[PDB]
Amino acid sequence: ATGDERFYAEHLMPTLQGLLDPESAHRLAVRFTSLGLLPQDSDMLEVRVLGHKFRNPVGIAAGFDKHGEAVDGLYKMGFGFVEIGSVTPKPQEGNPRPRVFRLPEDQAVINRYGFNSHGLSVVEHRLRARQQKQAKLTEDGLPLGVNLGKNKTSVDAAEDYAEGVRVLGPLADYLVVNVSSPNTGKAELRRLLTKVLQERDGLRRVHRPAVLVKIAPDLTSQDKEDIASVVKELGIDGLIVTNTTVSRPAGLQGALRSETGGLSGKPLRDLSTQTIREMYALTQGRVPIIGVGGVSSGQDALEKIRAGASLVQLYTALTFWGPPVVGKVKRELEALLKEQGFGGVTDAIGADHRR
Ligand SMILES: CCn1c(CO)nn(-c2nc(O[C@@H](C)C(F)(F)F)c(C(=O)Nc3c(F)cccc3Cl)cc2F)c1=O
Ligand SMILES: Cc1cc2nc3c(=O)[nH]c(=O)nc-3n(C[C@H](O)[C@H](O)[C@H](O)COP(=O)(O)O)c2cc1C
Numbered sequence: 001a002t003g004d005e006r007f008y009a010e011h012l013m014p015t016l017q018g019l020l021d022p023e024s025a026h027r028l029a030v031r032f033t034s035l036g037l038l039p040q041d042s043d044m045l046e047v048r049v050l051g052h053k054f055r056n057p058v059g060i061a062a063g064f065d066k067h068g069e070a071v072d073g074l075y076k077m078g079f080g081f082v083e084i085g086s087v088t089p090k091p092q093e094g095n096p097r098p099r100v101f102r103l104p105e106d107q108a109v110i111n112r113y114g115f116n117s118h119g120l121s122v123v124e125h126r127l128r129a130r131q132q133k134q135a136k137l138t139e140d141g142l143p144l145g146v147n148l149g150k151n152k153t154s155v156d157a158a159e160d161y162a163e164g165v166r167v168l169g170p171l172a173d174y175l176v177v178n179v180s181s182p183n184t185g186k187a188e189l190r191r192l193l194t195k196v197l198q199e200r201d202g203l204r205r206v207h208r209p210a211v212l213v214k215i216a217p218d219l220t221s222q223d224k225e226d227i228a229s230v231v232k233e234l235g236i237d238g239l240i241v242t243n244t245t246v247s248r249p250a251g252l253q254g255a256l257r258s259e260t261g262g263l264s265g266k267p268l269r270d271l272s273t274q275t276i277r278e279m280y281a282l283t284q285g286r287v288p289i290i291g292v293g294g295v296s297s298g299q300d301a302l303e304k305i306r307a308g309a310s311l312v313q314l315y316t317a318l319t320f321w322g323p324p325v326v327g328k329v330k331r332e333l334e335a336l337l338k339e340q341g342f343g344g345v346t347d348a349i350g351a352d353h354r355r
């Protein structure tokens, strides 16, 4: 471990988080990153998936940069790809404060932001302003994803996601649609994803993004079977596994454990990993998976890759370790690939299923 990794984890992050409320910490992080106020990837880390080169498999998950304000800084931090959003059609404020809660004893966060968004038009103009720079970044193995949401008052989710495809699809390497429990159904999911794909296929080939579906871990076995079936039937390009959990695993110690919202970080890790394992098996290893939930080490990343993830993302680990976590995960992942006899990340994808 480096000097910076230890300093940030043991001293700087605990001090800054002790002085700030959690939402102020988030806003300041976005501002610092956007300005590049921050501290070489080996070829073993390169992955080719989703019609693109990824110079490393470690991405920033949706939620950190909801409004596309810090994309270039996130690449400077060392992420192999960036996902912005969720972005809603119209601007909206989200839920009343307080809406973000730290559980330091669990290395977890709970949030109920409620899709606070600057809206598609603002994000469109922000991305347009750097679109050629992004085209070069993407060519150099640093792709951009855009996560689409829906407005609170919308009657038809398909219309909101269609609007997002039309407006931000031409500026993205991939798009993400979040899907909730269809049975608490399948025909409605099929309808939704059919419209998204028809809208996507309407874009000029040079600006035609991949489409991924992001799922929560709070799905029945029937929900997961139904999602896998629809994804294969329609030719959805990939899955993001997983969002935050509305469950509260036994053993949480944080005083704020009973706050409403989505739980992220370490308590989500193995729930996420098990969901990757299930979705990889249900899609016969033919649908790329981005693995997300509780990643803070090379071991955590490798467990998701071996379970079936082609790429991984993190967010919550940044809140505890700061920017040095990105280099930590990458260095540890490279070391573990070498220790286990893999030629690169590619050879490890789904390796637990071929035992
Ligand atoms: C879930 C909301 N949430 C929380 C609360 O739960 N924390 N948090 C983050 N806070 C961060 O730093 C805070 C403390 C700051 F005040 F220093 F900005 C950072 C971070 O990387 N900061 C940072 C940087 F961006 C550039 C150079 C040095 C540093 Cl230390 C990343 C985060 F995800 C965040 O999004
Ligand atoms: C504060 C916060 C905001 C989030 N906002 C979004 C969002 O807008 N859209 C989305 O798909 N996921 C969102 N997520 C979920 C993350 O993208 C990720 O799936 C989840 O937090 C698990 O990863 P982690 O344990 O590494 O944080 C958010 C997470 C947090 C903690």
Ligand SMILES: O=C(O)c1cc(=O)[nH]c(=O)[nH]1
Binding pocket: 063, 086, 111, 112, 113, 114, 115, 116, 178, 243, 244, 262
């Ligand atoms: O904005 C939010 O509340 C939010 C969205 C999402 O997809 N996941 C999450 O944990 N929070």
